Amino acid sequence: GVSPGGALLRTSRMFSLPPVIPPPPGNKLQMISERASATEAYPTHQVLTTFESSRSRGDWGLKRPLPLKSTTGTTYPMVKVKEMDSLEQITDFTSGTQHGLTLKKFQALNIPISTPSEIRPVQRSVFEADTDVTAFSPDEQIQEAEKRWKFSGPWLAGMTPGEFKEYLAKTVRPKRAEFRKFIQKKIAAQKTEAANRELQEKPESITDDEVTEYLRRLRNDNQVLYDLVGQFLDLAPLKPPSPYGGRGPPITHPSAGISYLRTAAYLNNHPIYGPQKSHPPVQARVLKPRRGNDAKIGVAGFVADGPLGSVMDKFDPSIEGGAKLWVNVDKATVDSTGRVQLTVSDAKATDVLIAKELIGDAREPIFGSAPK
Amino acid sequence: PYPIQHSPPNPRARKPRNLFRPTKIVYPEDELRRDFYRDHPWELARPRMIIELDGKDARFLDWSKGLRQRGIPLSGESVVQRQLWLMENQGMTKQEAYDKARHEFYKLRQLEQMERRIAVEEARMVGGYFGKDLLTVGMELENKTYESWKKWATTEIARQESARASMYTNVVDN
């Protein structure tokens, strides 16, 4: 049905570029800066790479070759293309290392992404077959609707007063006729459950006035109706009467495609010291000391809250390259806003010495010159 | 001429304009790519080479086998092509075919990350040493850049305190 030229373009590589996804959502009513913009929470464009023989020529599979001054010399060839050809007849591109290397630095932590917990710490993977599911059947009941993570309806608490009115006017209002049918299908289960439970000692499923009365009966118990309305509009659960309905469901996969490990329950076998007690520590940078009374640390390019415990209390211009702290990444999770939040904890003393020993920074090596 | 119509023209239009204007190329996979990469934003951080070698990639792609094909890397595109195949041949639905190809994609990514860690751990057990990693190289670059900011702040704060104190006309020196 398509010409041989159109058949090649379809399976082409440039045609397989993913569309630019919307940026990570922020406070809608809050002010921002439009001129300047820093790194985003998660990437929105695809990072591109070439062969070393092609990069020297500036060929990146794009319309035109890129300038060599701004694309050669570095170690990791990474580029983000905003427009393959803009109104200035140039390929508006930028470096893609801010996110390309943030992914490699994160995966160097060797930690999975667990489901958000409430405060008995039980880290459960997000790739479990019982929770990580998106295809549901119309017979899918309510008790199993909490395991899902991808809902078609919006989170009512997250919408603004304006977005909620537009939703009520254009999504739920024209679905009244369909909802009445949804009740009739339930009546088919209400008249058969009591009519087929004694046979082991379907209904017409089409009514007009019986539905009007059944809905009135539910006015005394509003909870049983919300579960019936939400199940139809496919709304994410809100309150317990369980799946972390505090901040809402995630706008992406619970892992966000940054890590695919399913557990950290393993021991690192050291060449000389055998297995280790905890995973190797990672050095972090101190940002925004307490003296907001909360501190921020940069671990593998991500910003997280400092350990619950100086260098993190007051700024010190004497320290070269800023204040740095060795820590251990206990848990990593993806909030409902798409951010990756780490629960950092202070690292032990002996561990930091073991890590520094391999790289050649330990002052008193634990091996050889350690009589006690 | 009348350009190729990649999408059906609006039938309700009675006086259509832009008849001699090329139309947008859209495939059934566009809807699928947007779904996957929105559920896996950090999948865009994995660099992908859109540079063509000989244009003969689609000659060895048989998506009836699995996600691992010849010539192309395991990427979000593989899930979309595998999903589209299931959603058309095996009659699965958009969500069902999505979950299947999506789960096959995770188990392969897990082995890739588990192999890096184990490959480095065993190398040291037999006298194998490596260079600096990104965690260390990334921090050193921040140090060198943090210093540049310190010099700027130290030189920029002196401007305000000096210009601030000199704001008053205390030059009389009474």
Partner: peptide, 21 residues
């Protein structure tokens, strides 16, 4: 102890230059 007060002044000075939250 006054030598500790001037440190608080120098600290807050840099905190003002970090124009980012």
């Amino acid at each position: 102890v006054q030598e500790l007060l001037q440190s608080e002044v120098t600290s807050n000075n840099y905190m003002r230059m970090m124009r980012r939250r």
